[PDB]
Structures are given as structure tokens and as C-alpha cells.
């Protein structure tokens, strides 16, 4: 799926909750979890647009109070082709 939803959290516990929520809520694939540094962790899902929207809403709600919480929830429905190179393609 083309769409990208991203949740950023302060800490990994919030990110895992968000991811679980996202993944459970809709048909999205977690394509990356990234430790940015400074304790920001970003979890990223790709799916069709409606799925991504539902997933991000869900994850955000979930992680808002887990740990230190949510920094950002963002959805980009079609990302520019170039932006794809900087985007993770498989979770590690």
C-alpha cells in the first residue's frame, strides 16, 4: 500500500503499543521502527489510505498515555518517489 502513517513516541513502550494498535486496527504493514536518538522512536506503517488513516488514529489514541507518550502522528497518502528512498521497507 502506498500510504504512510508514522507515529513518534518518546520511548519504545509507547511505540510498541502504537504499533500493536495500528496493526490490529487495520490492514497495514509495519515497515519500520526507528530509534532516532534522544529517545524518539518512530514506528511506520504502509497500507491503503483508509487503512492507514484508521491505524494512525488508533495508534495515536493508544500510545498517548503509555510511557512518555506521543510526539507525532502523521499520514502521507502518496509520498513522493524520492521520499521513498529514505523510508524503511522492512521492520528490523
Amino acid at each position: 500500500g502506498i500510504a504512510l502513517g508514522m507515529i513518534e513516541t518518546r520511548g519504545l513502550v509507547p511505540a510498541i503499543e502504537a504499533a500493536d494498535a495500528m496493526t490490529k486496527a487495520a490492514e497495514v504493514r509495519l515497515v519500520g521502527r526507528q530509534f532516532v536518538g534522544g529517545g524518539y522512536v518512530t514506528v511506520l506503517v504502509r497500507g491503503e489510505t483508509g487503512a492507514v488513516n484508521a491505524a494512525v488514529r488508533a495508534g495515536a489514541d493508544a500510545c498517548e498515555r503509555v510511557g512518555d507518550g506521543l510526539v507525532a502522528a502523521h499520514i502521507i497518502a502518496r509520498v513522493h518517489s524520492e521520499v521513498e528512498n529514505i523510508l524503511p521497507k522492512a521492520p528490523q
Binding site: 503499543e17 486496527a25 483508509g50 488513516n53 498515555r65 506521543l70
Partner: protein, 117 residues
């Protein structure tokens, strides 16, 4: 705070160890996007809606990219609808007698010269 699945549903669960209009009024609402993009109805569940936390795609994201200036130019519509209330000359009457099918209570029919017909 142990967050998790057990912090959910407070006050709605029993048997525990411790215990022992969907669609908004139409007249009021005019949807931003109509059709299958309408938001009048409250569809609960995992719908495609985006909340306050979520950012991206629409609000400043589309409205910022390209620079624009608008101008307060003079807008005067010339159309059949705009001219619906154009001032009109006094309506013609008929003084004719004899059987003429002289209906005066209907629409305005005019004849050569502008005569009521």
C-alpha cells in the same frame, strides 16, 4: 501506572474479584466533501476519519505548497439567473374585446410591439 488492557472499561465490568440521530440534521450541516466523502453520519469503528492528533495530507499541507495572491476584483454576474430581477418596463395589458381567448391571469405572452397576447 501500569497501563495496558486492564485500565480499560472502568465501571463497566462486573464479576471481577473487586466487584465481589446517528446522522446529523441535514439542514444544519453542509459537508466539505459530498458523496462518499460525507461526514454527516457517525460511522464508528475503524473508519477513514482523521483526528486532532493526526497531521498531514490536507489542512496546511495542501494549502501551503504553492504561493498565491487573491485580488478583490469587480464581480458582476451577467447571466439569465442574475437578470431574473432585472428592472422591467411596465407590463402590457389588453383592451381588446371580442372573443380573443384573452387570458390575463396567466403568463405573459407578447405579440408584435410588445402587446399582451
Amino acid at each position: 501506572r501500569i497501563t495496558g488492557p486492564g485500565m480499560l472499561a472502568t465501571g463497566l465490568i462486573t464479576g471481577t474479584p473487586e466487584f465481589r440521530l446517528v446522522c446529523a440534521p441535514r439542514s444544519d450541516q453542509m459537508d466539505r466533501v459530498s458523496g462518499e466523502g460525507k461526514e454527516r453520519c457517525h460511522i464508528t469503528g475503524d473508519d477513514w476519519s482523521v483526528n486532532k492528533h493526526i497531521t498531514g495530507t490536507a489542512g496546511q499541507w495542501a494549502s501551503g505548497r504553492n504561493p498565491s495572491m487573491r485580488g478583490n476584483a469587480r464581480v458582476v454576474e451577467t447571466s439569465a439567473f442574475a437578470n431574473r430581477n432585472v428592472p422591467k418596463p411596465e407590463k402590457p395589458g389588453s383592451k381588446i374585446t371580442g372573443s380573443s381567448g384573452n387570458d390575463t391571469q396567466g403568463s405573459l405572452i407578447t405579440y408584435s410591439g410588445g402587446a399582451r397576447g
